[PDB]
Amino acid sequence: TIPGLSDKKASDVADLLQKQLSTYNDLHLTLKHVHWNVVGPNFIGVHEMIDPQVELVRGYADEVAERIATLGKSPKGTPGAIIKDRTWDDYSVERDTVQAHLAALDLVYNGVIEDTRKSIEKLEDLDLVSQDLLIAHAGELEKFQWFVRAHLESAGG
Amino acid sequence: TIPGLSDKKASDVADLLQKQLSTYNDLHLTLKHVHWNVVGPNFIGVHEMIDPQVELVRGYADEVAERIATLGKSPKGTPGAIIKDRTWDDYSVERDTVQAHLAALDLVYNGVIEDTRKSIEKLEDLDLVSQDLLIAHAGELEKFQWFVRAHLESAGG
Amino acid sequence: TIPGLSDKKASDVADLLQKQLSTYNDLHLTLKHVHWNVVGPNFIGVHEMIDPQVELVRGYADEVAERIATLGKSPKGTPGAIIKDRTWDDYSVERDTVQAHLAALDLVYNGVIEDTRKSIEKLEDLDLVSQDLLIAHAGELEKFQWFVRAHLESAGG
Amino acid sequence: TIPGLSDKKASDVADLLQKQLSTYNDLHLTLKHVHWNVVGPNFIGVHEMIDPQVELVRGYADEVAERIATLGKSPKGTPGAIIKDRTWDDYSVERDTVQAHLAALDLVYNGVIEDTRKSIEKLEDLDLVSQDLLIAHAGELEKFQWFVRAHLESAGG
Amino acid sequence: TIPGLSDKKASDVADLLQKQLSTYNDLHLTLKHVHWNVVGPNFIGVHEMIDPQVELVRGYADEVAERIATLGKSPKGTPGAIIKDRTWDDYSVERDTVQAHLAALDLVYNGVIEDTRKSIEKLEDLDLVSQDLLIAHAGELEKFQWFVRAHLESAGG
Amino acid sequence: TIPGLSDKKASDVADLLQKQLSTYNDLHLTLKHVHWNVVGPNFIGVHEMIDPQVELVRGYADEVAERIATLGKSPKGTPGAIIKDRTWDDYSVERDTVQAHLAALDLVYNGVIEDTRKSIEKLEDLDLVSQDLLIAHAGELEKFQWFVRAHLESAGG
Amino acid sequence: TIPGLSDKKASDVADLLQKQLSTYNDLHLTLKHVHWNVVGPNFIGVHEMIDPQVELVRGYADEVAERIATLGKSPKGTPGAIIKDRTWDDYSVERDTVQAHLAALDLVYNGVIEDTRKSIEKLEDLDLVSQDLLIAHAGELEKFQWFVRAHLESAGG
Amino acid sequence: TIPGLSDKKASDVADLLQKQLSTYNDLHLTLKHVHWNVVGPNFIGVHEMIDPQVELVRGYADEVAERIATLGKSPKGTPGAIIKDRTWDDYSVERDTVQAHLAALDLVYNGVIEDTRKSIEKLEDLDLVSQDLLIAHAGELEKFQWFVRAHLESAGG
Amino acid sequence: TIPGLSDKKASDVADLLQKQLSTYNDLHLTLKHVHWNVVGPNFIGVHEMIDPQVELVRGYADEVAERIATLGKSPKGTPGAIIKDRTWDDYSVERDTVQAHLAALDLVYNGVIEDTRKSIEKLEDLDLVSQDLLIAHAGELEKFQWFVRAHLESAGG
Amino acid sequence: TIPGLSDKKASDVADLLQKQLSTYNDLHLTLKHVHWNVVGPNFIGVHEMIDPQVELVRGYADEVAERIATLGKSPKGTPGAIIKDRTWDDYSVERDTVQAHLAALDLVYNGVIEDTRKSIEKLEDLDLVSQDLLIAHAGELEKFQWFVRAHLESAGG
Amino acid sequence: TIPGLSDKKASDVADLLQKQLSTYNDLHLTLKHVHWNVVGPNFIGVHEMIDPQVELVRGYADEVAERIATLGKSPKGTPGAIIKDRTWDDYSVERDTVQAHLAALDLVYNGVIEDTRKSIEKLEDLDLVSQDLLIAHAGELEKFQWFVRAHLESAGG
Amino acid sequence: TIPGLSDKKASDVADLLQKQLSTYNDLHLTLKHVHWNVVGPNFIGVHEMIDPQVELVRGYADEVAERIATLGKSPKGTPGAIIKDRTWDDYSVERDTVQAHLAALDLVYNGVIEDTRKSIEKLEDLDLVSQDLLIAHAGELEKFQWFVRAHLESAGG
């Protein structure tokens, strides 16, 4: 009954986003979880290096959901609703080192930027504005992965 | 090992808090979920009434996790970790009026302020400082429930 | 004599933005007009929900013109210049309730996001950067229409 | 012993203001009283709508009292001193809806902009500066009545 | 049905302002129009010189319209409503030098400080508060004309 | 019909805060009254030493009521409501020196911190969170009385 | 050649202000002079009490001079131009106590609020806007005299 | 002669605090000393991780002393006065690694949170407000120890 | 190894960007060089017109380097590294008028917006996110060139 | 009776700063005088290029006096006190173009940086800290003269 | 090893500074000690007069320690470390009037500005940059002593 | 034709600064280059530890050039113009560890503080103000080297 223009084409994208909407929600809790379980002789560096990224992604969440409802469908943001769309195993790492946790996080982001890049191409035709949302997000998500990656590498590790 | 003092008495409280860090995490997600599914001829009021409360509880999330780690134990923040501690059904309400959602939230807070209150008496003897945390939280959580409650009462609604 | 690259292809987009430029100017006035004429028991919510949107679009305006002028052409922002490009009737709603004004506004935006979407596609070949401007604008304009829409619905009203 | 110019004229304006300093102090308490007793599906709108106005009037309080001492006389700020100058009944309205409290407030303001206007003309030939003080307040106070009025009215309600 | 005091007198001042609300809205668009059409070896000076003045006048707009609704009448903000009250020709001047546009602006302001002054005296015996509003604006508007004038003149040019 | 937990035990604390609520309101006025009546060669120090304290207590006020309303009861903040609970004479000191007003204030606070201490203990069983409110308030109120006391002593004056 | 309205009337008000622009510039220097020459067991109170007032008056300076150029005439800001308009002796008082300097300042202000008031009435029938300027200043200047006066006085001293 | 209520009971707590008052003073210098002698390939992390804690504890100092004087006794804050109450050996570590310095600091905090927790229980009866001071402090002191601890540990080291 | 996805397609873009990070670095230095060699009776205008643009491009510098590292490759930022990628002659103009320098800069931007534009088409297929970067940049770079261009044009200068 | 070290050697520097003190005061007025008398098509650039400089020097003033008073002597800041030390003619330039006023100002500064340089060397033995004051001041004063100079030259005008 | 240049000449200065870092540390503690033991009918004046000076000297503390470490040597900041370098008796004065305390502080500064001055001449040849540090400090330290001195002087007190 | 005073003596210093002006320019790019190529398990620490230093030195650049032009000569800031004055080999280190890069950077600063200290002594006679510029800079440059150095050392490494 209400999107910006295309009854169907939108419902497609509305579900594309909801998949992202839930990945971020796992993401920011996951990030946060990592932040307070990270440990060892660089913990404050990373612990904090994270906090912007939490705050950023959390917002990415808002931007998705607000978009979805803009598209017409309803966004779903309860932990129930994320296990539903989720496709990793929930971050299993616990009190652990940086290296452990970033190794761990690298792979998590790996899902996210892969999925997001895919929803980007899917969107290229359907809805460009929403393509642009994730494109923005994506730069920032990728960047953050580079931060985490740079913590463990040398020649090209 | 590490706590502030009592190898056991802490371990006891570190699960009280872990019961809580998971409740808030549910809460903040839930609030947020409510923030962007709310609707009607008062939606912006509440919508924004909420946004501080998210940001606040989310921070409540940090405070107690950071405390858990302080007590010694590791805090558990992944959405898996909150289904594990969760006691209610996850928030049932989707796109829907303010009126619905606040009834819905009212009930949610009802878990939280009761649960937190109970954890406060439990804390009175064991660890006082952790009592103080939840006491602070409690004031602000309860307050917010009165914000939400006031939305549907005259005589004594 | 001056653009960034294509004498004709620019003149084409400079005529496009100009149509937009004037739509926004109508809009920020329209918005503002609505804002100090809205009324009823939801008044302040909306009265203020608006003000950011005014300010945003007003800036959206500066971005049009400065782009036009960048493109080479001269941009036009006098009330005479806007009636010249204006393709709607001017906002007919005088003092009134919220519900009225938002229905009225919903329609106005219907014009704006429809038109903007069209100038986006018109631009996908022409000039990508100008495409980017409006894609940006678009998300935010659309978002705002959802804010107003969410004010009068439930199932899918 | 000390004013700026007219040893008598000043004393006349000095009590004029004291009547205002007391009305405001009633006002600011009254506003605050209303703000935390308001209720219903619109409470946070008004509840907050009000807050700037409290802080504003309170300041208005400062400006006149400081002005009185400037004039020469001593200003009187205690609840005893306001009951003494007061000439309404004190806000009778207790926990209650918006529409109720705003009806009530509307009337309260009615005493204020009436009395303040009256004290302005009285002041045209006493002391202009002091005239300007209240003229300033007047706009702002009047504006705030319109905010509250706008809550119940349709074509001219 | 509602003003602060005089059921008629108010309606008289109410249209006075509406004449202003429309002049300003022309003004603010006009200013903005000039700002992005100015040019030559002095453009950024003026281009910016202007910006505070736009934001200022725009605000001046708010203050009178809000004032009108305060008075009782409804204020009229659409481009249709300004062409309707307008009594100049609309800014004819298109891309062009500083000196050109400032000459043009000077004249535009000339209508404004003239008309505004006239509406002030008219107001001395209608409504003082509303008189003060424009007196305030007057200083600021007048000041801005002097800024623009100061651009071409030597001994008295 | 609504509190956080105990229908009676709340009504008991809601009557306690209410007594406090009104003490503060008297206080912020009293403070403010003192502030613009203080005088002598120490005037500005104190004149300003006060203003934070006003503002603090005023907020202390909001915290009472919002707690009361949270507790379920309706809070009462009209000057009539404060004389009703008021257990002192209203601040009798009119224009005067610092030394006078602080002696006068020292006594007023003597009432406040005495009473607050008592409602704290009354609360240690009743409602802990409300206990926490006033404990917070207390430290700051006490601190302030020391600020005023420190103004007139040496050995232990 | 250029004012806003009255080619003569304006010149009359233009010198009125120049008398003020010079009084202020004396004033602001004078204030500053006092501020760094004050002394005794109260110096930092006043020393600072003053600082806002300098910055304020200095600004008052700007407002009238800018106003003069607005009126048409050129304003005159050099020490030569103030000795020229000046009509007191220059602050004779050198390093010295508070009470001394405030006595001295009190008198200085006395010239100011007297002269400024006189220039206001003179202005009621020349130019109202310019009248408002000084009325504004007047409150603020007058307020500052009361601050300084309040330093030595008991029952009416 | 002056506390809030209990001549003796207060003098007891007044000395309890002074012990803390001096521990913090050792603490913030000690922290600071550590901050500029820390070294190695994570120094900036910790170096900065410290700086908030200095600023925080330093304030904790103020809060103690101000409380003491509030209680009636005089607070003692000279390096003489801290050696007097001190009970560790002064931080002996010098230009040294992080690990060294945090190992070193862990143990220092160990004294502090142990002592503070003890003064907490001592206070539970005597003066609750002061109990609350340290309780607040304590959370924050403990938290900071968790930061330092987390720098050297893995499984539970 | 590391990129977001395509081992080659990235490597390709990582030199597109490296072509750019070096162009900006030249640019920001050049701008700055121009900022403090500019001169004439409009120097401050432009001088300051520039300072944002430096700070902005400099940040453009970070964004793409940080992207390069994200894509996997290492970014090269030393002045050696920019002579290596540089395609124009380094900025020829020394102390000299605005008019000269903007002609000079105009030509400089002409390299940049053309080059960046070309790199954007090149990016359309390979890596979209990196396209978006330069697209954003482009808008702002081109804009600035219009600021500079406007400094010497009427008819179509 | 009081300096930092040398009864005579201070009195010598206290007479030096005093000469400076008054030069600045003349200057800030002079600057300010220039600022609201400048004119032509470069007006706003300079009109504002100045304001920081005013404010800076004004503060330069406070630093002189406070230093003098620190040195032991009493500093002198009344317009009479500045003509007493003043070694130039007062700024003769009334309304005028930029080019004029800056030529005029260039000369004024010529006095200031010449004199300041001389009091610097005079100080290299006398009092180093006072030397430092003026060295600071100097750089900034000189810098500003270059700002004004750069306004009227090219080869080396 | 590490310094900026001279293996010895630095080592020499690194104890000059270490003499200073310990003096300031005493100072800031002492100031603070004075801030909260001050008392009388001017206590807030001075009390607050001090608080910047603490914060400032404390930072003076960092600057020179950070310099020491820069010169190569390790700085020593523990209260043990300041009794080791300390040359006066620790601050003798307990709860006591302003007048006492400033006499007391006056004497304290007297050590400091003399000592620092002497260390500045000592530095003139060896290390200039470190001279500049203490020179900066000196201005501000001496200044503060004049603030304190001014509290008890007329003729030449 | 224009410096502050000495045709030659200045041209000497003008070239002294230009050598520094270019070292910084290499410096800030070099720093920046280091910041985005730094890597390993402390990268965020240093990566950020750098960013202030970039921003700081970049400004140091401005301060030089602005000074040069103040001296009369023209400052040269193009990458061409830095290779011209440069005397290291351009930073050759590429994607590499912290330790590598700081080892690398230590030596770079080594040039800079050595050169700057030398231009300091050269300046001691010629121009003191410019001596002071670099002296300021120098403290800060040295400090930053201490930060980098402290990352690799223990006993005195």
Which residues on chain B place their C-beta less than 8 Å from a C-beta of chain A?
A: 25-26, 29-30, 32-33, 36-37, 58, 61-62, 65-66, 68-69, 74-83, 86, 90-91, 94-95
Q: Nearest 5 degrees, angle CA J95-CA J96-CA J102?
A: 120
Contact F139 H67 (CB under 8 A): yes
CA dihedral C32, C34, C37, C38 (to 10 degrees): -120
Give the sign of the dihedral formed by CA I85, CA I88, CA I89, CA I93. negative
Alpha carbons J115 and J122: distance in angstroms, whole number: 10
Alpha helices by DSSP H, C38-97: 43-71, 79-85
Chain I: residue whose CA lies nearest to J42: I42
- Gyration radius of chain J's alpha carbons: 16
- Residue D89 burial class via C-beta count within 10 angstroms: exposed 0-12, middle 13-18, buried 19 and up: exposed
Backbone interruptions in chain A following residues (C to N > 2.5 Å): none
The answer on whether J142 is annotated among ligand-binding residues is: no
DSSP H helical ranges for I3-127: 7-37, 43-71, 79-85, 98-125
The answer, yes or no, to whether I and C have at least 3 beta-carbon pairs within 8 Å is yes
- Report how far Cα K107 is from the mean position of its chain's Cα atoms: 12
Give dist(CA H58, CA H24) in Å, integer: 7
Measured CA to CA, the distance from residue A68 to residue A12 in angstroms comes to 11
CB nearest K96 (choices: F48, F99, F154):
F154
Pull the structure tokens for residue F99: 């030394």
H or E stretch including G121? helix G98-124
Closest by CA to H27, choosing from H93, H118, H100, H91, is H91
Q: In angstroms, rounded to a whole number, what is the distance separating the alpha carbons of residues C102 and C93?
A: 10
Contact I75, L36 (CB under 8 A): yes
Q: Is D43 in contact with B150 (Cβ distance < 8 A)?
A: yes
Which residues from A are below 8 Å from C150, CB to CB?
A: 69
Neighbours of G103 (CB within 10 A): 17
- Closest CB to E45 among I45, I99, I153: I45
List CB contacts of J144: < 8 A, sequence separation 6 or more. J53, J56, J109
Nearest to B154 among D44, D45, D97 (CB): D97
**Among residues C71, I109, J42, I154, which one has the least CA distance to residue E38?**
I154
Give CA–CA dist H45/H102, Å, rounded.
Answer: 12
Hey, of K62, K68, K125, K129, which one would you mutate to test binding to chain L, going by the most L CBs within 10 A of its CB? K129
Task: Write out chain C residues lying below 8 Å of B95, CB-based.
Answer: 154
Distance from F84 to chain D by nearest Cα, in Å? Answer: 11
Q: Are D134 and D112 in contact (CB under 8 A)?
A: no
> Distances in Å between the alpha carbon of L4 and those of C107, E68, L10, L71, L103?
67, 60, 8, 6, 41
Say which amino acid occupies K130.
Answer: S
Residue pair D1/D55 in contact (Cβ under 8 Å)? The answer is: no
All residues at 6 or more sequence positions from H62 whose CB lies less than 8 Å from its CB, including other chains: K32, K36
CA gap D91, D87 in Å, rounded: 12
d(CA A28, CA A48): 14
CA atoms within 13 A on the CB side of K63: 20
**Total Cβ atoms within 10 A of residue G12:** 14
Q: Are L96 and L39 in contact (CB under 8 A)?
A: yes
D13-34: b or e for each residue (b if 16 or more CB lie within 10 Å)?
Answer: bbebbbbbbbbbbbbbbbbbbb
In terms of C-beta density within 10 A (0-12 exposed, 13-18 middle, 19 or more buried), how is residue I135 classed?
A: buried
* Pair A4, A71: CB distance under 8 Å: yes
State which residues form the domain around F107.
Answer: 1-157
Residue K47: in which H helix or E strand, if any?
helix K43-71
The neighbour count for residue G7, using CB atoms within 10 Å, is 10
Contact: J81, G95; criterion CB under 8 Å: no
Is the CB of C145 less than 8 angstroms away from the CB of A70?
yes
Is E35 assigned a ligand-binding role in the annotation? Answer: yes
Nearest by CB to J36, from G69, G89, G91: name it. G69
- Distance between CA E109 and CA E87 in Å, rounded? 13
Give SS3 for D47: helix
**Closest Cβ–Cβ partner in E45, E152, E154 for J44:** E45
The encoded tokens of residue J91 equal 């700024």
> Which chain F residues touch K41 with a CB distance below 8 Å?
42, 98-99, 151-152
Neighbours of chain A (3+ CB pairs under 8 A): B, C, H, I, L
- Tallying the residues shown for chain C, one arrives at 157
| Spatial CA neighbour of I34 closest among L62, L114, D18 | L62
Helix (H) or strand (E) holding K147: helix K128-149
CATH number at residue B14: 1.20.1260.10
Query: What does each C-alpha distance from H104 to H60, H109, H140, H143 come to in angstroms?
Result: 22, 9, 19, 17
Sequence-ordered list of residues with C-beta below 8 angstroms from that of A152, at least 6 positions apart, any chain: A99, A102, A103, A106, L40, L41
CB I123 within 8 A of CB I151: no
Residues of A with CB under 8 A from a CB of H: 38-45, 95-97
Interfacial residues of C (vs E; Cβ cutoff 8 Å): 25-26, 29-30, 32-33, 36-37, 58, 61-62, 65-66, 68-69, 74-83, 86, 90-91, 94-95
Gap between the Cα atoms of D68 and F36, Å rounded: 9
- Encoding tokens for residue F23? 């003490």
- Whether B40 and C151 have beta carbons less than 8 Å apart is answered as yes
Contact between L42 and H40 using a beta-carbon 8 Å cutoff: no
List CB contacts (< 8 A) between G147 and chain F.
43-44
For the record, the structure tokens of K34 come out as 């004075």
Q: How far apart are CA F31 and CA D77, in angstroms?
A: 9
Q: What is the secondary structure of chain H as a DSSP string?
A: --SSS-HHHHHHHHHHHHHHHHHHHHHHHHHHHHHHH--STTHHHHHHHHHHHHHHHHHHHHHHHHHHHHHSSPP--SHHHHHHH--S------S--HHHHHHHHHHHHHHHHHHHHHHHHHHHHS-HHHHHHHHHHHHHHHHHHHHHHHTS-SS--
Extract the tokens encoding C75.
């941009």
N-term to C-term CA, chain K: 52
- The alpha-carbon gap from G14 to the nearest alpha carbon of chain E, in Å, equals 14
Flag if J74 and G83 touch (Cβ within 8 Å).
Answer: no
Question: Mapping DSSP to helix (H, G, I), strand (E, B) and coil, where does residue E128 land?
Answer: helix
For every residue of D12-34, DSSP letters joined together read HHHHHHHHHHHHHHHHHHHHHHH
Structure tokens that stand for C38 in this block: 């809205």
* Quoted resolution (Å): 2.8
Secondary-structure breakdown of chain G: helix, strand, coil percentages, each rounded to the nearest 5: 75, 0, 25
* Integer Rg of chain E from CA: 16
Those residues of chain H whose CB sits closer than 8 Å to some CB in chain K are: 25-26, 29-30, 32-33, 36-37, 58, 61-62, 65-66, 69, 74-83, 86, 89-92, 94-95
Minimal CA separation from F135 to chain H, in Å: 6
Q: What is the rounded CA–CA span in Å between residue C67 and residue C19?
A: 13
Q: Strand, helix or coil at C77? A: coil
Closest CA to B25 of B47, B68, B67, B54: B54
Measured CB to CB, residues of chain K less than 8 Å from chain G are 42, 45-46, 48-49, 98-99, 147, 150-154
Any chains having at least 3 CB pairs less than 8 A from chain C are: A, B, D, E, I
The size of the A-H interface in CB pairs under 8 A is 30
d(CA I5, CA I12): 13
CA of residue B41 relative to chain centroid, distance: 28
Neighbours of chain B (3+ CB pairs under 8 A): A, C, D, F, H
The C-alpha of C111 sits at a distance from chain A's nearest C-alpha, in angstroms, of 10
Per-residue DSSP letter, F42: T
CA dist B89 → A80, B19, I144 (Å) = 9, 15, 56
Rounded to 5 degrees, what angle do the CA atoms K16, K18, K20 make? 75
> By CA distance, what is D1's nearest residue in G?
G156
- CA G121 – CA D106 distance, rounded (Å): 37
Of the candidates G42, G141, G146, F99, which has an alpha carbon nearest to the alpha carbon of residue D75?
G146
Mutation target to probe the J interface, by most J beta carbons within 10 A, among I39, I48, I49, I101 is I39
Contact assessment for residue F117 and residue F138, using Cβ atoms and an 8 Å cutoff: yes
Look at chain I and report how many structural domains it folds into: 1
DSSP, res I18? H
> The dihedral of CA A19, A22, A24, A26: what is its sign?
negative
Q: In whole angstroms, what is the distance from residue F133 CA to residue F17 CA? A: 10
Tracing tokens 């199932």 back to the chain, one arrives at C155
First to last CA, chain G: 52
Min distance G1 CA to chain D CA atoms (Å): 32
Using a 10 angstrom Cβ sphere, with 0-12 exposed, 13-18 middle and 19 or more buried, the burial of residue B125 is exposed
| Neighbouring subunits of F (3+ Cβ pairs under 8 A) | B, D, G, H, K
DSSP-assigned letters across all residues of A11-41: HHHHHHHHHHHHHHHHHHHHHHHHHHH--ST
